[PDB]
Structure 1
């Protein structure tokens, strides 16, 4: 009728999962008045005697919406693709989050103006203890921002280089991944970039994942169509690889393979398909039935070398092909130390040694721009709807 109009409507400006919750319409305008504030463009009286209309409020506003310098920063604990990731303390709230920055200019040059929207959903909406909580997501003119709960444990690589991982342990860190993946599968998706660089540790010693650029909601029947290669090249699936230029079409067995390559980097110290060359590490993978090989070690328990070889294999054969369940059942997770629903409940294998609200001991240490629009570019564009706060009870 009519009430259920101005009704079904209002609960669509609050709905965060919406394309238009207030915070998004904002994000809209803000990002437009950025793309018309040019002398070039105002030779036209539409732009000029409109941007005039909204000067004295478009200013009054960028002043409020969680602006970037609301945060002062501690250490920078990660550079990467597009810009860095810093450990920040909120100048007001005194709370410590871990801010991800995205270089806007360099993100439209590398022609990836949207690979993150799934990382927004996942991080902020899959309420999970396997997922790194996304607390606020705000933008300005030059960059993007994602304020994430901070993980003082470090990546898994900081670990494998500072300890010589035992099987007792590779049983743990592995099955805590297996869980955090069947998480992200039955949240609808598929990860694809599955490496120790992307596994962090909460102050409790247990594990969470971050970086979800690569992700992608599976179609109706469980697969995906994609003709581009993705993820670090040591851990890359053979299906995800030979897709690079070809009718690539894969399920979620491609996260599974990545896991075997990890159960290996842990128990042997180097990766299973290493090679000098970007192209040399790809040829080891291709010839996997022939190139995979363990050193002069038979201390590698029979049933561990035996799991690695069930993941590292053709996709139609690969363990997990017929259920995330036949994985939990491997003779390799036998132990008087637990069963599964209690895993992140138990006590870590290695527990982080921290001194203060922000000890980055487990971490190591570390202005281009735009062209003034002739006509109307539309740069600040598919960066809209990206804002999201918390408040929601």
Structure 2
């Protein structure tokens, strides 16, 4: 078991999960150079000499390390207000990826600069067939970049829009979502907004969760307190809505509420609390005991209705509070084609037809930003706008 301090330090340098690995320490240097190199700061001789020593090295370093220029932008497949996601191809290797851009200017300006660490951690390290993998994270003075596996299947909002979804399909996607969420919970995170938008389909048509921006690490009780609120309330549980008003802590069962809403949406065609205003939806959700209604059309399988109602319910009695096994045993999951352990080896309901490795047909097309880069006022003294981003770089090795 014993290791010398020298061995320990050496492990720290090579460990991908370490904040002191080489790539992380390169960040520090790179950031310091960015933030010190202005004519006013250079009147300090300490700073001026430091930068003279290090600027040859720093320019060559910035040249060797991975950079935005290493990738061609094929098309824009998503937009998030801190930036966007682009289909890219690497120049040397020709491999195709999805690349997320995050704007350092906006994050600083809007003073939301800490939110992406969970998403980095999850996608880099989950090592699960249920989670979009992060291959490379890098940065320049303007953006953070995340190079992810491309998911040409597109998302579940698209699929629900192009198809009428039978119970057999719904059972399949629901089950894959149950397993994805359990993987995330097992990593110690609560997702906090689960919804069709966050569910991507791969080449074989099997689901993975993407977009981990709202995830939070559970404490030892398995609880979190939402930091950021979220956007649309449609898939959000009552206890999460209430906690937004300062009330308290919630646990992972908030994610299972969302699955309930999702199931309902696939089967019924609308979300169960839908309303043409935000406040109308918020109200329906709080009033869920009364507001939850099953449709005119059909009596859909009672097992389905039963599962949905088991999810949409106060947290103390909600399905999943006793763990994921009680969910997997629900009669709604009983079927011929697959078992829980073999689920991902099954042939999927919709397998995408793809003309090229570049085919975006499952994504709504977006033009381009074409807007212009804003810059901070020039430092009169050390400001350190790059400091929050030190340690972001990551290379799967």
CA distance in 1, matches of 2:44, 2:355: 59
Question: Mind listing any 5+ residue stretches in structure 2 that lack a counterpart?
Answer: 367-372
Deviates more, 1:108-117 or 1:71-80: 108-117
Q: Deviations over 1:325-345 (max 9, x none)?
A: 111111211112222101011
Given the superposition, is the C-alpha separation of residues 277 and 2 from structure 1 closer, same or farther in structure 2, using an over 3 Å criterion? closer
- Measured after TM superposition, the shift of residue 190 of structure 1 is 0.9
What is the number of residues matched between the two proteins?
Answer: 391
Deviates more, 1:234-243 or 1:274-283: 274-283
Q: Deviations over 1:191-220 (max 9, x none)?
A: 111010000011011111111111112111
Alpha-carbon contact 1:138-1:386 (below 8 Å) kept: yes
CA distance in 1, matches of 2:115, 2:166: 37
Alignment of 1:346-385 (within 5 A): 346-366=346-366, 367-385=373-391
CA distance in 2, matches of 1:227, 1:191: 13
Alpha-carbon contact 2:337-2:346 (below 8 Å) kept: no
Deviates more, 1:223-232 or 1:373-382: 223-232
TM-score, length-scaled by structure 2: 0.95
What SS does the corresponding residue of 2:270 show, helix, strand or coil? Answer: coil
Deviates more, 1:266-275 or 1:168-177: 266-275
CA distance in 2, matches of 1:326, 1:7: 45
Residue 72 of structure 1: aligned partner: 72
CA distance in 2, matches of 1:132, 1:356: 21
Deviates more, 1:87-96 or 1:272-281: 272-281
Alpha-carbon contact 1:136-1:147 (below 8 Å) kept: yes
Residue 370 of structure 2: aligned partner: none
CA distance in 2, matches of 1:228, 1:362: 30
CA distance in 1, matches of 2:285, 2:375: 39
Residue 323 of structure 1: aligned partner: 323
- Measured after TM superposition, the shift of residue 222 of structure 1 is 1.6
Alpha-carbon contact 2:225-2:243 (below 8 Å) kept: no
Given the superposition, is the C-alpha separation of residues 250 and 390 from structure 1 closer, same or farther in structure 2, using an over 3 Å criterion? same
- Measured after TM superposition, the shift of residue 77 of structure 1 is 0.5
Q: Deviations over 1:223-261 (max 9, x none)?
A: 223465335311011111111131320111000000000
What SS does the corresponding residue of 1:63 show, helix, strand or coil? Answer: helix
Residue 240 of structure 1: aligned partner: 240
Q: Deviations over 1:340-380 (max 9, x none)?
A: 10101111011011011111111111123322123221110
- Measured after TM superposition, the shift of residue 110 of structure 1 is 2.1
Given the superposition, is the C-alpha separation of residues 362 and 52 from structure 1 closer, same or farther in structure 2, using an over 3 Å criterion? same
CA distance in 2, matches of 1:338, 1:231: 35
Given the superposition, is the C-alpha separation of residues 356 and 228 from structure 1 closer, same or farther in structure 2, using an over 3 Å criterion? closer
Alpha-carbon contact 1:170-1:267 (below 8 Å) kept: yes
CA distance in 1, matches of 2:228, 2:152: 34
TM-score, length-scaled by structure 1: 0.96
Deviates more, 1:293-302 or 1:149-158: 293-302
CA distance in 1, matches of 2:384, 2:363: 39
CA distance in 1, matches of 2:285, 2:2: 62
Alpha-carbon contact 1:119-1:212 (below 8 Å) kept: yes
Alpha-carbon contact 2:232-2:278 (below 8 Å) kept: no
Given the superposition, is the C-alpha separation of residues 288 and 59 from structure 1 closer, same or farther in structure 2, using an over 3 Å criterion? same
Q: Greater share of helix residues, 1 or 2?
A: 2
Alpha-carbon contact 1:202-1:208 (below 8 Å) kept: yes
Alpha-carbon contact 1:224-1:250 (below 8 Å) kept: yes
Residue 5 of structure 1: aligned partner: 5
- The answer as to 2:144 corresponding to 1:140 is no
Alpha-carbon contact 1:214-1:231 (below 8 Å) kept: no
Q: Deviations over 1:79-129 (max 9, x none)?
A: 113111000000111111110000111012222111111111110111110
Question: Mind listing any 5+ residue stretches in structure 1 that lack a counterpart?
Answer: none
Please report the RMSD computed on the Cα atoms of aligned residues, expressed in angstroms: 1.6
CA distance in 2, matches of 1:323, 1:59: 52
- Measured after TM superposition, the shift of residue 6 of structure 1 is 2.1
Alpha-carbon contact 1:156-1:197 (below 8 Å) kept: yes
What SS does the corresponding residue of 1:105 show, helix, strand or coil? Answer: helix
